[PDB]
GROMACS .gro file of C-alpha atoms in nm:
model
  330
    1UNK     CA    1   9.737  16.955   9.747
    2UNK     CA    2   9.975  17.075   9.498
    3UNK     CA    3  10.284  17.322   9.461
    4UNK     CA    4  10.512  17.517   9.249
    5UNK     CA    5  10.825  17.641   9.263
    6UNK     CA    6  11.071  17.843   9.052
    7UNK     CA    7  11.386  17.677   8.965
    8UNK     CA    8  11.742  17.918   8.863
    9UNK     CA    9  12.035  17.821   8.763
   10UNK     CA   10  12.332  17.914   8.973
   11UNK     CA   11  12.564  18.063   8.714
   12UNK     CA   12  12.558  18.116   8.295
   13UNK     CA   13  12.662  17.789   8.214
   14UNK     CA   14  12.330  17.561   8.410
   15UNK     CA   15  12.562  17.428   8.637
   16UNK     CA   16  12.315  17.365   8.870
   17UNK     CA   17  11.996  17.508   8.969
   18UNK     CA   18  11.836  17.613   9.298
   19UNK     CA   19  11.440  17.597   9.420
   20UNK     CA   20  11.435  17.809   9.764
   21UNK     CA   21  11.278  17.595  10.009
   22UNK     CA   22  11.095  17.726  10.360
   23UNK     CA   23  11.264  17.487  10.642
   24UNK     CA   24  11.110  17.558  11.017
   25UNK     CA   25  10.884  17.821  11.214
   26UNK     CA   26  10.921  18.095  11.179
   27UNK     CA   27  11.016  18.062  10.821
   28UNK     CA   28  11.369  17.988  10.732
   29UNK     CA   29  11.410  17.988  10.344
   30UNK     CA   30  11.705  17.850  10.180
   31UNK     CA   31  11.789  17.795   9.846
   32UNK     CA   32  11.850  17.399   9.749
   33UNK     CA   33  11.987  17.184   9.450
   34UNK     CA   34  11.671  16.958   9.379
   35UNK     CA   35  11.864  16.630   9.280
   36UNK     CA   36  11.657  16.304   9.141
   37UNK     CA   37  11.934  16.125   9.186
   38UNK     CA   38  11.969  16.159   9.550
   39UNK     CA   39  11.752  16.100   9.881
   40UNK     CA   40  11.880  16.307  10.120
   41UNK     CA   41  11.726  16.693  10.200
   42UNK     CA   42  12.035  16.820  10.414
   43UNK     CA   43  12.126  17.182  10.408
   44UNK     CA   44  12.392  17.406  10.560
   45UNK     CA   45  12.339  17.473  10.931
   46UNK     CA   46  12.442  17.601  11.275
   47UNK     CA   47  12.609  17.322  11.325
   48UNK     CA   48  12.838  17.307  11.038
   49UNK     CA   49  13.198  17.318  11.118
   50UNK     CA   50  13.269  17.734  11.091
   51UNK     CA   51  13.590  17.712  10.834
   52UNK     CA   52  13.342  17.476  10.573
   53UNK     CA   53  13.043  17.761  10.541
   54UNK     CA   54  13.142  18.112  10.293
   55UNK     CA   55  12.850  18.267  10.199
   56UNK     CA   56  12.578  17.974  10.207
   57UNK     CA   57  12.266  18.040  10.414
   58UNK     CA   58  12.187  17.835  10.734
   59UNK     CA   59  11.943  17.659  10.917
   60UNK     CA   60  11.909  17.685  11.256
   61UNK     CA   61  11.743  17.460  11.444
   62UNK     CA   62  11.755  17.645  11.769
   63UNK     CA   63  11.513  17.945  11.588
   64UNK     CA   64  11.279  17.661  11.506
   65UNK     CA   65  10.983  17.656  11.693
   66UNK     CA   66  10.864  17.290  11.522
   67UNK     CA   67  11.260  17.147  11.499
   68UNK     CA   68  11.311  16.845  11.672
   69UNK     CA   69  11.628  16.643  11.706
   70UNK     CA   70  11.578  16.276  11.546
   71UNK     CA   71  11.788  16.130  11.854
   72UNK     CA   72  12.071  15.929  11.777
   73UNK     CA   73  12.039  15.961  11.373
   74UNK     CA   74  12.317  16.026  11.175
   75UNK     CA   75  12.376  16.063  10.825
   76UNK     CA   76  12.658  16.012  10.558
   77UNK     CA   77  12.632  16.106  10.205
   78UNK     CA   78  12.924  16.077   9.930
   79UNK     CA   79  12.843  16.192   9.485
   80UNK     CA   80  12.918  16.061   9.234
   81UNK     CA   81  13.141  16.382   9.193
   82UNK     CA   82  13.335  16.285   9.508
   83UNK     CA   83  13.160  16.553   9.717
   84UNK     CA   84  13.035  16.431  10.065
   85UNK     CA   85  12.877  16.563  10.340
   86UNK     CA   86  12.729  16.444  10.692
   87UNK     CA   87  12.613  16.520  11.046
   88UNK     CA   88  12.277  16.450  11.239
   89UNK     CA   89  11.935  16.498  11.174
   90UNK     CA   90  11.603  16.713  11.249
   91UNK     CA   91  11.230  16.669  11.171
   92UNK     CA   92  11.064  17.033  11.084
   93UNK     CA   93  10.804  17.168  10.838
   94UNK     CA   94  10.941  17.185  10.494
   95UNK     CA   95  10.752  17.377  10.227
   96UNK     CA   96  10.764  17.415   9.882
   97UNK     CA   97  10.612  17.615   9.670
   98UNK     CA   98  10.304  17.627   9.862
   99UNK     CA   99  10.323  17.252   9.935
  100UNK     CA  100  10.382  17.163  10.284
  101UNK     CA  101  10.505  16.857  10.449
  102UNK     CA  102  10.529  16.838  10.870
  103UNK     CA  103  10.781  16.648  11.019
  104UNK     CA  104  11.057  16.622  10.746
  105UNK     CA  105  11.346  16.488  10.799
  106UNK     CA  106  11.578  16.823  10.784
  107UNK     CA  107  12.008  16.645  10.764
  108UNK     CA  108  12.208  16.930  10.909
  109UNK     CA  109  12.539  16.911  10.828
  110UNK     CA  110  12.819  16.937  11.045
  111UNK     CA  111  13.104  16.884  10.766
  112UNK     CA  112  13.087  16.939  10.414
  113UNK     CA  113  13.337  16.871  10.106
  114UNK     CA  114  13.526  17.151   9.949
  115UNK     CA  115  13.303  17.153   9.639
  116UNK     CA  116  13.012  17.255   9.859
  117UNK     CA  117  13.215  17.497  10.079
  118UNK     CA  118  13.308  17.667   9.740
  119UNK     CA  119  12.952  17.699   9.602
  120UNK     CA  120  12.811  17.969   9.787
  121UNK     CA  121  12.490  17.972   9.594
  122UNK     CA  122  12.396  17.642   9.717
  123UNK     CA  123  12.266  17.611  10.062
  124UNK     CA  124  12.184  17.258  10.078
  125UNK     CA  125  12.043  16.970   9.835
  126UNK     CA  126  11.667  16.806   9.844
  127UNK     CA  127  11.657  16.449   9.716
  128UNK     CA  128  11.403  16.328   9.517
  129UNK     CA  129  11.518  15.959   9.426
  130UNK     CA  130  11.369  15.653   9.594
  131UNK     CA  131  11.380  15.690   9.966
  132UNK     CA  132  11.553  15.362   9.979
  133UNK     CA  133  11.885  15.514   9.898
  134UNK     CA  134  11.865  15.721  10.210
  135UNK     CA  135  12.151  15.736  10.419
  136UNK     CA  136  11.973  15.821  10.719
  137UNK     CA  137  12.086  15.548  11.035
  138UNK     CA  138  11.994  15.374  11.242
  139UNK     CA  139  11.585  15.462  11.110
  140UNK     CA  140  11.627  15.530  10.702
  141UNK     CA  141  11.424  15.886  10.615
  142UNK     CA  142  11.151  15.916  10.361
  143UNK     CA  143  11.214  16.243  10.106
  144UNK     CA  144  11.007  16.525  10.090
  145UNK     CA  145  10.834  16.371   9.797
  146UNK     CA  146  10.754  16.002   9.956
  147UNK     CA  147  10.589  16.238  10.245
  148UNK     CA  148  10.418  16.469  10.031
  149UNK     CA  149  10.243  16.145   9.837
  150UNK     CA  150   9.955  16.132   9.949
  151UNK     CA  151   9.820  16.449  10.003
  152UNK     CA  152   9.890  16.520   9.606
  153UNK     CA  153   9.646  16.540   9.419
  154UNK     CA  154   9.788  16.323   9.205
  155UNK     CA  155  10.114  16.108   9.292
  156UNK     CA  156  10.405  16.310   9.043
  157UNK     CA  157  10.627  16.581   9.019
  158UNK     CA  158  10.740  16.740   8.760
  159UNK     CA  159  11.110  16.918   8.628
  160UNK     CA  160  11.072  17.188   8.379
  161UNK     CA  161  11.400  17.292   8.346
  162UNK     CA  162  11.527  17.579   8.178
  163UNK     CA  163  11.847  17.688   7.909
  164UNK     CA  164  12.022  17.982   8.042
  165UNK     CA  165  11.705  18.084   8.197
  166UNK     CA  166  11.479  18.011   8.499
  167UNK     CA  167  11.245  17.718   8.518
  168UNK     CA  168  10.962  17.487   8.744
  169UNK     CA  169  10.935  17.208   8.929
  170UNK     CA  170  10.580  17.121   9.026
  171UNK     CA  171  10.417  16.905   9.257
  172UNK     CA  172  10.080  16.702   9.226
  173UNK     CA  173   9.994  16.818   8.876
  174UNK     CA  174  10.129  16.841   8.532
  175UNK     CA  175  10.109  17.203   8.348
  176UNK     CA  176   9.952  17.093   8.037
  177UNK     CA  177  10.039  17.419   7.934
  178UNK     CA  178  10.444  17.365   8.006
  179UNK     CA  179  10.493  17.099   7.695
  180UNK     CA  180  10.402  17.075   7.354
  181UNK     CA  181  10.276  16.753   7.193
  182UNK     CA  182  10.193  16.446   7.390
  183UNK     CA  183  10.414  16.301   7.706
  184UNK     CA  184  10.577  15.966   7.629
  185UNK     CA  185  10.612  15.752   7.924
  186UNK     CA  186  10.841  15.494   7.979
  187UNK     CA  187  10.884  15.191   8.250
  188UNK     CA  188  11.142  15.269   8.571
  189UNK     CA  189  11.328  15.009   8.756
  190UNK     CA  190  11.382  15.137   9.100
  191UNK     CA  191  11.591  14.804   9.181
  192UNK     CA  192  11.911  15.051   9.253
  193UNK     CA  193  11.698  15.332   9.404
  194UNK     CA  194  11.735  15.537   9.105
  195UNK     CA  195  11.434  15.692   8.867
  196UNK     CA  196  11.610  15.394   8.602
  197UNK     CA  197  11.487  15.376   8.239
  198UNK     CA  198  11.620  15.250   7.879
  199UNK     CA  199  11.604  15.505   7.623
  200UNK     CA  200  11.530  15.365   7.259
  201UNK     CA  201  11.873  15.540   7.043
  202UNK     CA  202  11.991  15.816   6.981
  203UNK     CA  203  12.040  16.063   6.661
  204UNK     CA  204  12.357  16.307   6.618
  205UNK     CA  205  12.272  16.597   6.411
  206UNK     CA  206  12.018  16.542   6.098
  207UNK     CA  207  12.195  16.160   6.127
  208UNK     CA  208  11.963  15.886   6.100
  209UNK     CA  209  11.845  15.751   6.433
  210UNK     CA  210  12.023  15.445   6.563
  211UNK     CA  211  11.772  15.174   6.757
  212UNK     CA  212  12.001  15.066   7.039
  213UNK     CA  213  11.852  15.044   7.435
  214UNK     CA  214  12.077  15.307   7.657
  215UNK     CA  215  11.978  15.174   8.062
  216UNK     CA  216  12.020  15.523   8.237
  217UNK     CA  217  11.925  15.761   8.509
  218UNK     CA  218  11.712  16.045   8.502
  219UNK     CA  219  11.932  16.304   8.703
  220UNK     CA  220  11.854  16.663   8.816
  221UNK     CA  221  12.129  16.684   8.984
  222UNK     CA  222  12.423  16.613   8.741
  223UNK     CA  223  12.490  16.859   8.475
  224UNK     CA  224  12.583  16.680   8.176
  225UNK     CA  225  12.452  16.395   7.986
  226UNK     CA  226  12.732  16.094   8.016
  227UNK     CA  227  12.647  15.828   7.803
  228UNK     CA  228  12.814  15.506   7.678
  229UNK     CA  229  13.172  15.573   7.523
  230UNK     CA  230  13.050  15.442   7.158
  231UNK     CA  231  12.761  15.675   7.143
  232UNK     CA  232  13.007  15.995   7.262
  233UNK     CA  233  13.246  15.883   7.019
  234UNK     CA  234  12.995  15.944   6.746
  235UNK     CA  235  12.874  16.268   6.854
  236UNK     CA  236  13.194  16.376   6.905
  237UNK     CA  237  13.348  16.265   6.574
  238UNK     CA  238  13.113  16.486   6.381
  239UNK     CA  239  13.254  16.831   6.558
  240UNK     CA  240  13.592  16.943   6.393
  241UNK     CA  241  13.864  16.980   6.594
  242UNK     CA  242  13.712  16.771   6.916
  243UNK     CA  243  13.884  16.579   7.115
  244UNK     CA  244  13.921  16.356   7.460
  245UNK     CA  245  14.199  16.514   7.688
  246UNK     CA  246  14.280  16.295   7.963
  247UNK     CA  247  14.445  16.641   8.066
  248UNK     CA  248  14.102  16.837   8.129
  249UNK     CA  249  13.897  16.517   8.202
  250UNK     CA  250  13.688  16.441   7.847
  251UNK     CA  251  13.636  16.576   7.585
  252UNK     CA  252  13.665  16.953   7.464
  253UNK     CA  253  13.601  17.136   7.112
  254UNK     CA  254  13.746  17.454   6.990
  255UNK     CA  255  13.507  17.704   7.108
  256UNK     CA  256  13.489  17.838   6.729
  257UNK     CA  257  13.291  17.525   6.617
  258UNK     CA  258  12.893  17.478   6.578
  259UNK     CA  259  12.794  17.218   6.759
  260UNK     CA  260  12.516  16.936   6.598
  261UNK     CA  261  12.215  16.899   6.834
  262UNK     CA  262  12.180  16.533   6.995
  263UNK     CA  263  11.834  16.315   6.977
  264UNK     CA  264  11.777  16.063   7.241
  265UNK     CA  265  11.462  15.837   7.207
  266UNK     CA  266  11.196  15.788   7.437
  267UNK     CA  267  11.014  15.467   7.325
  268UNK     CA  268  10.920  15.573   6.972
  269UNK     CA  269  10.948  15.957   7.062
  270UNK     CA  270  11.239  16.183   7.023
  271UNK     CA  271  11.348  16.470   7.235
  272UNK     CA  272  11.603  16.685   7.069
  273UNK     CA  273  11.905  16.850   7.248
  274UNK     CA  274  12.001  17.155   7.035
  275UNK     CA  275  12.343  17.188   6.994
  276UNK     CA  276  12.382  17.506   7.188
  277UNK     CA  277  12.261  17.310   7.514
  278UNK     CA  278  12.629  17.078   7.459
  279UNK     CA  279  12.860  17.400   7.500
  280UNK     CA  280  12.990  17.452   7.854
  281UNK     CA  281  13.250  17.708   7.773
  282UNK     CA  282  13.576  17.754   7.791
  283UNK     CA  283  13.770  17.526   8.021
  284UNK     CA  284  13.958  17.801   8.167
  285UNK     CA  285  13.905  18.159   8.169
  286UNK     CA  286  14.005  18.292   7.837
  287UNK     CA  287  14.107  17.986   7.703
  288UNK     CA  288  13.971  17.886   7.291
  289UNK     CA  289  13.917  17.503   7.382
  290UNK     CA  290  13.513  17.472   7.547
  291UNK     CA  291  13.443  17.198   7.750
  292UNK     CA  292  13.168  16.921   7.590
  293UNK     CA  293  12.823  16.855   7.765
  294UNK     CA  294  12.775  16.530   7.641
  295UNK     CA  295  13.101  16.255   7.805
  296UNK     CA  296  13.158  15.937   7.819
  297UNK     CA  297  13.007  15.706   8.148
  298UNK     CA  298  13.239  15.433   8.163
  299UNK     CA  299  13.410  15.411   8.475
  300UNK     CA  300  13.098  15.613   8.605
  301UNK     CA  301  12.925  15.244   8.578
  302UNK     CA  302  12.593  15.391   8.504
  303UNK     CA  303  12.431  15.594   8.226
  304UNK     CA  304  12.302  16.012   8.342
  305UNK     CA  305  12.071  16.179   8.195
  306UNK     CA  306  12.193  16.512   8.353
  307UNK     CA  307  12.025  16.878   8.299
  308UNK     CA  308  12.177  16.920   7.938
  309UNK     CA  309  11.939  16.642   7.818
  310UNK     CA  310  11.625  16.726   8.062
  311UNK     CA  311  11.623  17.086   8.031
  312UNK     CA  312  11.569  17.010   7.640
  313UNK     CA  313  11.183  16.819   7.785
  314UNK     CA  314  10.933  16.861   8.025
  315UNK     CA  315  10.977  16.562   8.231
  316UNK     CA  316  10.715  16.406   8.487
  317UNK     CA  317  10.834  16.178   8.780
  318UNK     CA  318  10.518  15.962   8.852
  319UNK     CA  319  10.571  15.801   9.125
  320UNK     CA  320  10.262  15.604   9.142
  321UNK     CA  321  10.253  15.243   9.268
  322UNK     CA  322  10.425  15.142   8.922
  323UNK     CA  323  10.665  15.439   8.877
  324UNK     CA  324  10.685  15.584   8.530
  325UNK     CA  325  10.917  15.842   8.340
  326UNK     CA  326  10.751  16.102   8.098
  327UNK     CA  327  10.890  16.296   7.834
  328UNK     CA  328  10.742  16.592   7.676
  329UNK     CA  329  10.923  16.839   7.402
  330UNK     CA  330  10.833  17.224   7.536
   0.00000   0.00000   0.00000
């Protein structure tokens, strides 16, 4: 089996980008935040607490001819954003994109952070990390992909994300028509849960590349690239005017400048962010200083490669017995 699915981004700046997703019988559809760097498929529900839903759409269990409480689970689940969410936990069929896996476990929230409250365009999130970061309890869940396994016809899936525009995220097959050139895979450590590999350097503009191993996460669900403070520095020195503002949080550029594109390697291949993908406007409505894509990850503790650097490849999640990362320019 395969499937397909259309991915959009939520607003103009690829803050995020939502795959609907058909939960239960009859049909409920809802549109969720595919994040590799999560395990847990919870949405918005019935059950959430009244003054935490504005404008999300719900699943409800009760319509649900093939919902079945999981008795006695419970889930927790806190971002590296500081956004959380919890509450208990269905099983239901769960399709996407014509791919369809029975008895999923559905996380129906009954209280959810502001951030989540405030993003009405996001009705819940589907993880797609190792299912060993589940937060399931007391019986840890599997994620849509670990059930989906092995019916694929083959064991991946892949994230074709787009720049200002729509996108895919396939399931069971790679689109040789999606890339252009060869994929270049790389080893993944799963040790922390995470879809974990070392990229080989990185280039800043037409700047020769620098050979120097970056340990980081492949992340759909963060929207910027943070890498190592050293590496930022030097991108950021070579934009006039740029800056780190402890003010606004990292660093910003006046919205007038150009910005140089940023080259990250992938064993002895190169994927190229154009400079265009770094801008995420101004930091405030009307305001001439533009907020950076690419920050610094220390005191995150961990290296992201968020959307601004995958929606620059076609990357494939192979999740075969030895996982692997591949990346494809498109």
């Amino acid at each position: 089996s395969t499937g397909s699915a259309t991915t959009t981004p939520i607003d103009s700046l690829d803050d995020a980008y939502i795959t609907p997703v058909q939960i239960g019988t009859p049909a409920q559809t809802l549109n969720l935040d595919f994040d590799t760097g999560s395990s847990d498929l919870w949405v918005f529900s019935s059950e959430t607490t009244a003054s935490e839903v504005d404008g999300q759409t719900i699943y409800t269990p009760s319509k649900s001819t093939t919902a079945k409480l999981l008795s006695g689970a419970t889930w927790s689940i806190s971002y590296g954003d500081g956004s959380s969410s919890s509450g208990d936990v269905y099983t239901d069929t769960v399709s996407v994109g014509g791919l369809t896996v029975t008895g999923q476990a559905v996380e129906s929230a009954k209280k959810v952070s502001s951030s989540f409250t405030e993003d009405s365009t996001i009705d819940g999130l589907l993880g797609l990390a190792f299912s060993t970061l589940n937060t399931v309890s007391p019986t840890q869940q599997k994620t849509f992909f670990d059930n989906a396994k092995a019916s694929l016809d083959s064991p991946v899936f892949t994230a074709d994300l787009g720049y200002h525009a729509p996108g895919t995220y396939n399931f069971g097959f790679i689109d040789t028509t999606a890339y252009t050139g060869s994929i270049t895979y790389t080893a993944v450590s799963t040790k922390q849960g995470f879809w974990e590999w070392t990229s080989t350097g990185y280039a800043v503009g037409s700047g020769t590349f620098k050979s120097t191993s970056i340990d980081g996460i492949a992340d759909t669900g963060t929207t910027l690239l943070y890498l190592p403070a050293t590496v930022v520095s030097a991108y950021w020195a070579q934009v006039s005017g740029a800056k780190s503002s402890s003010s606004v949080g990292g660093y910003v550029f006046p919205c007038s400048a150009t910005l140089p594109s940023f080259t990250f390697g992938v064993g002895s291949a190169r994927i190229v962010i154009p400079g265009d993908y770094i801008d995420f406007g101004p930091i405030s409505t009307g305001s001439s200083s533009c907020f950076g894509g690419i920050q610094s990850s220390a005191g995150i503790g961990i290296n992201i490669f968020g959307d601004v650097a995958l929606k620059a490849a076609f990357v494939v999640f192979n999740g075969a017995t030895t996982p692997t990362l591949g990346f494809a320019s498109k």
